[PDB]
Amino acid sequence: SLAEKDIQYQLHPYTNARLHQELGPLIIERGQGIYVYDDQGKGYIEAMAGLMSVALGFSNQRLIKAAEQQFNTLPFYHLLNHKSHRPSIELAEKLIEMAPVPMSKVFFTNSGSEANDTVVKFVWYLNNALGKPAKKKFISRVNGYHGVTVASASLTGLPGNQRGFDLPLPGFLHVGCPHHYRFALAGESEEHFADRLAVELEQKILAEGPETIAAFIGEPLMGAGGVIVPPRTYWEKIQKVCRKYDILVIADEVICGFGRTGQMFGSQTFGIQPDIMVLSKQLSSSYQPIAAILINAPVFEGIADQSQALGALGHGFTGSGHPVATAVALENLKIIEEESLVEHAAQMGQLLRSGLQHFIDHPLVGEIRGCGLIAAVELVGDRVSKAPYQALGTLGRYMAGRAQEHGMITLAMGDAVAFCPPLIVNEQEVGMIVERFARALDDTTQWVG
Amino acid sequence: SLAEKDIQYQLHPYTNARLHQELGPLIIERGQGIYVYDDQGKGYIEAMAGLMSVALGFSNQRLIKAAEQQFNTLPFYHLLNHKSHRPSIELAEKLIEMAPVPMSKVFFTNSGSEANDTVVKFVWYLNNALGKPAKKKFISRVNGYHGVTVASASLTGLPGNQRGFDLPLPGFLHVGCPHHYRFALAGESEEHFADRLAVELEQKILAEGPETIAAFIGEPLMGAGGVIVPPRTYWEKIQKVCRKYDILVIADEVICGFGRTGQMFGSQTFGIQPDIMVLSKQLSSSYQPIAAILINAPVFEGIADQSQALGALGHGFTGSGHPVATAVALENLKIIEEESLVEHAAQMGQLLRSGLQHFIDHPLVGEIRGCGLIAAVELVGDRVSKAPYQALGTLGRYMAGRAQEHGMITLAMGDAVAFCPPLIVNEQEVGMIVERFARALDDTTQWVGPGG
Numbered sequence: 049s050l051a052e053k054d055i056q057y058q059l060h061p062y063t064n065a066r067l068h069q070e071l072g073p074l075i076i077e078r079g080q081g082i083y084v085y086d087d088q089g090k091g092y093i094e095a096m097a098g099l100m101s102v103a104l105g106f107s108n109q110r111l112i113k114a115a116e117q118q119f120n121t122l123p124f125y126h127l128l129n130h131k132s133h134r135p136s137i138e139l140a141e142k143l144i145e146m147a148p149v150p151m152s153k154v155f156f157t158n159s160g161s162e163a164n165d166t167v168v169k170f171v172w173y174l175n176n177a178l179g180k181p182a183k184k185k186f187i188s189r190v191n192g193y194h195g196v197t198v199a200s201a202s203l204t205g206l207p208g209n210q211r212g213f214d215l216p217l218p219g220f221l222h223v224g225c226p227h228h229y230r231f232a233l234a235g236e237s238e239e240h241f242a243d244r245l246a247v248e249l250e251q252k253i254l255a256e257g258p259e260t261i262a263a264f265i266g267e268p269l270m271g272a273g274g275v276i277v278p279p280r281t282y283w284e285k286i287q288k289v290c291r292k293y294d295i296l297v298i299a300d301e302v303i304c305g306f307g308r309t310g311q312m313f314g315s316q317t318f319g320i321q322p323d324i325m326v327l328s329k330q331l332s333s334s335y336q337p338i339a340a341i342l343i344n345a346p347v348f349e350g351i352a353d354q355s356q357a358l359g360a361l362g363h364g365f366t367g368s369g370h371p372v373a374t375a376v377a378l379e380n381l382k383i384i385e386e387e388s389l390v391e392h393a394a395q396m397g398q399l400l401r402s403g404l405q406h407f408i409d410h411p412l413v414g415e416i417r418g419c420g421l422i423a424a425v426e427l428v429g430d431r432v433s434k435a436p437y438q439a440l441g442t443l444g445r446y447m448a449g450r451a452q453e454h455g456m457i458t459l460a461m462g463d464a465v466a467f468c469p470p471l472i473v474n475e476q477e478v479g480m481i482v483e484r485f486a487r488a489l490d491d492t493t494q495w496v497g
Numbered sequence: 498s499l500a501e502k503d504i505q506y507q508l509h510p511y512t513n514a515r516l517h518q519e520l521g522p523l524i525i526e527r528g529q530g531i532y533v534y535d536d537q538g539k540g541y542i543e544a545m546a547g548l549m550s551v552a553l554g555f556s557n558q559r560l561i562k563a564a565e566q567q568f569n570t571l572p573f574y575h576l577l578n579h580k581s582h583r584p585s586i587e588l589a590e591k592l593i594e595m596a597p598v599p600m601s602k603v604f605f606t607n608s609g610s611e612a613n614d615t616v617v618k619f620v621w622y623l624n625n626a627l628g629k630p631a632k633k634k635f636i637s638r639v640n641g642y643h644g645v646t647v648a649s650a651s652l653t654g655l656p657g658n659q660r661g662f663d664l665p666l667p668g669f670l671h672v673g674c675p676h677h678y679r680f681a682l683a684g685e686s687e688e689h690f691a692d693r694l695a696v697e698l699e700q701k702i703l704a705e706g707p708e709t710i711a712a713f714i715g716e717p718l719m720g721a722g723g724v725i726v727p728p729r730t731y732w733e734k735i736q737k738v739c740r741k742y743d744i745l746v747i748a749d750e751v752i753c754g755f756g757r758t759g760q761m762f763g764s765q766t767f768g769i770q771p772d773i774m775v776l777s778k779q780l781s782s783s784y785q786p787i788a789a790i791l792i793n794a795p796v797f798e799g800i801a802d803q804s805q806a807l808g809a810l811g812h813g814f815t816g817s818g819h820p821v822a823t824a825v826a827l828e829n830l831k832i833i834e835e836e837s838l839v840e841h842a843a844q845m846g847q848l849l850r851s852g853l854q855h856f857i858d859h860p861l862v863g864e865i866r867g868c869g870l871i872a873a874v875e876l877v878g879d880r881v882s883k884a885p886y887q888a889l890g891t892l893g894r895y896m897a898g899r900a901q902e903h904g905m906i907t908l909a910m911g912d913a914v915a916f917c918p919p920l921i922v923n924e925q926e927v928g929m930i931v932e933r934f935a936r937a938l939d940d941t942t943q944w945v946g947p948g949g
């Protein structure tokens with residue numbers, strides 16, 4: 049059977065390999081709209097849009113035709129040694145012109161992980177170029193997600209991404225997760241929470257030596273780490289501290305990018321003025337692996353100078369700007385703009401968040417959080433103590449399993465279940481997502497008993 | 498114009514960004530078979546198959562239809578949390594069953610760089626799982642190429658990949674480039690050279706502490722480093738040293754994989770029995786970004802053990818095993834098998850090397866090297882000293898420029914002019930590749946004026 053071949057031959061990411069050898073896979077055969085189907089023909093709402101990525105859903109014919117047209121023209125070429133091609137150029141133009149702050153240049157990669165890894169190298173290269181060889185350290189946040197390379201997983205602030213991998217590397221620093229529900233002191237306002245986080249950052253910088261700190265990287269809101277909306281005034285006050293010590297602000301838009309948070313970019317939603325932006329996922333609705341780094345004039349000018357001094361920029365991937373990946377992403381962004389999906393997603397997000405808010409007084413519901421068309425419901429064993437049932441993750445695992453039984457694919461992030469549907473979700477589809485959440489919660493409530 | 502937008506908006510890899518603002522791009526518009534065409538309609542033989550990658554050439558309709566059929570079925574899904582899909586499973590099966598040594602599991606990534614970076618993490622994870630927490634250092638070679646992440650560029654042994662990037666990281670060690678022509682002692686045999694490299698490796702291991710050395714990684718034949726064929730008995734003697742100290746052997750097959758070297762794998766051509774193999778490029782003819790790690794039973798078993806103890810394996814990329822990329826790769830490997838392209842490439846490789854060897858006593862030709870359908874001509878200013886004409890790289894750059902003028906895209910690696918055509922290259926086309934090399938060499942010879 050296909051399931052036995054999978055057990056025999058594939059090591060799965062983010063999977064217990066031994067449990068996999070026992071249970072085998074859930075094989076997804078096909079998709080259309082917001083739905084995927086297993087090999088038994090059971091349909092599921094992809095409430096996660098795959099990996100917070102499939103913006104236009106699973107059967108957008110314009111993307112499929114854009115791939116075909118590029119395949120039949122030039123199915124592969126590269127950008128090395130002055131070589132170029134139309135889809136990379138037209139995508140780079142569109143990305144610079146739609147950027148929420150003035151940007152200079154695009155550098156393409158296959159993945160968000162490769163992109164953040166590349167940003168680390170580019171910042172090191174830049175500060176070497178500027179004669180600041182000590183200005184190399186990165187500050188990220190607890191529960192931040194920035195990818196899985198040796199360097200990008202050091203940026204990542206999830207313990208499950210570091211345990212057993214001897215990470216983080218030296219020079220990769222973490223300050224606090226900006227999650228009021230978990231980290232605010234008794235009675236502390238959002239603004240006062242934001243103050244204390246800005247202080248933590250300033251004190252980390254002073255303790256490490258400001259001359260040693262190159263960059264601060266953050267997702268506008270934290271996706272994979274639990275759909276963590278920062279408190280009011282966090283980004284304003286954090287940026288003041290960064291500008292104070294000449295620290296680059298990197299906006300990781302891998303999940304927030306292209307209409308997830310109620311505006312085109314999380315940088316717009318949260319008032320971020322980044323030096324560097326990292327884009328992926330909704331860039332192509334994940335129909336092709338592609339990510340993009342936007343760098344502003346000063347970062348480009350320094351890198352360009354050093355690329356001349358050292359002969360050439362000694363960096364690039366075979367797939368960097370792949371013509372099929374760039375052609376699909378270009379068409380994807382045109383569809384998001386032509387179909388006004390940023391504003392449609394904002395409207396569907398209000399319906400999603402209002403539907404979930406009906407459960408705010410459920411005895412297992414600790415917090416309902418969200419922004420735009422991304423949300424999470426964090427379950428707890430006790431609302432007063434905020435303590436888990438048995439152990440962190442026990443409720444989330446059971447909930448995600450029940451959701452699947454009820455025909456919905458969600459992702460458990462500890463004891464939070466996430467919602468990140470395709471931007472094309474309609475009103476009754478949002479209603480069905482909340483209904484399947486409600487069934488899963490009912491089952492979880494009877495289970496905890 | 499398209500060229501002005503390119504200059505305005507794109508930072509190019511492996512490009513002098515200032516020179517790019519001055520000269521602008523060469524824009525490639527379309528391709529078919531072994532040919533690409535610029536936006537002025539000038540045709541070029543892609544003698545490099547893009548980046549040593551486009552095995553089936555630029556218009557294979559079977560790959561384009563395999564992509565369409567997968568797009569119209571399931572255009573994205575992932576492999577996280579037990580999720581799977583048919584193309585990843587059937588590709589994983591094909592890869593394990595064609596492996597040159599017994600392999601256990603496939604792990605998919607988007608790129609060779611991500612794959613080698615992932616191998617680093619998996620080896621660290623494995624030795625932690627086995628209770629050998631000191632056994633973490635990697636040994637690679639000077640002029641090796643393994644990618645551009647912070648970790649994979651530390652494995653890479655080219656200075657241009659490290660200079661200005663604060664690389665390599667600690668724990669990433671380099672031993673000698675196995676290039677007889679450049680690094681042998683005057684009058685040393687290939688076998689004696691192989692002995693001395695094996696001694697250097699043993700002495701590095703002993704000097705560092707054998708208990709601290711996890712892995713040795715090598716391309717069977719070095720691609721980006723200049724098509725460097727190792728000396729006879731190198732891989733035998735290096736592996737003996739590795740097995741002596743319980744050091745994993747990683748075969749980087751990103752270029753050698755799928756018929757480039759005269760057999761399906763460089764591991765077969767060079768008698769390597771690796772613990773881990775890394776595959777990309779010809780896997781999909783670069784029609785889709787995909788790479789694959791093959792791990793043997795012992796590597797899998799230790800990772801699997803720790804993945805249970807820690808709840809799950811905390812690693813993976815969004816695109817890992819992308820259904821369109823895996824579907825295209827699966828069809829690509831079927832075509833290579835059905836069209837006997839490993840055998841055809843071996844035949845075309847003999848014709849290519851014979852054609853170039855007409856120039857073996859040229860005053861600027863220092864060495865003609867390769868095997869299967871990968872070759873390089875290393876030009877020198879002086880055959881006795883092996884010294885370059887003007888700065889190292891001058892002849893390579895001039896040759897690559899002339900080749901382009903004569904309708905051929907080749908890559909210079911210093912003064913080595915490389916050949917890595919699509920596997921589908923025919924006998925006449927090999928003839929035209931060598932003809933355009935000959936015109937470039939004639940131009941370069943008139944430019945230098947060797948006299949003598």
Ligand SMILES: Cc1ncc(COP(=O)(O)O)c(CN)c1O
Pocket residue numbers: 099158159160161162164193194195196267271272300301302303328813814815816
């Ligand atoms: C915010 C964020 N940043 C970076 C990454 C890394 O992406 P990739 O999986 O494409 O390597 C992810 C992926 N979940 C992400 O969510």
Ligand SMILES: Cc1ncc(COP(=O)(O)O)c(CN)c1O
Pocket residue numbers: 364365366367548607608609610611613642643644645716720721749750751752777
């Ligand atoms: C031998 C080898 N290893 C690894 C890589 C890295 O591949 P990628 O560009 O897909 O990251 C390359 C790419 N030229 C390679 O040639």
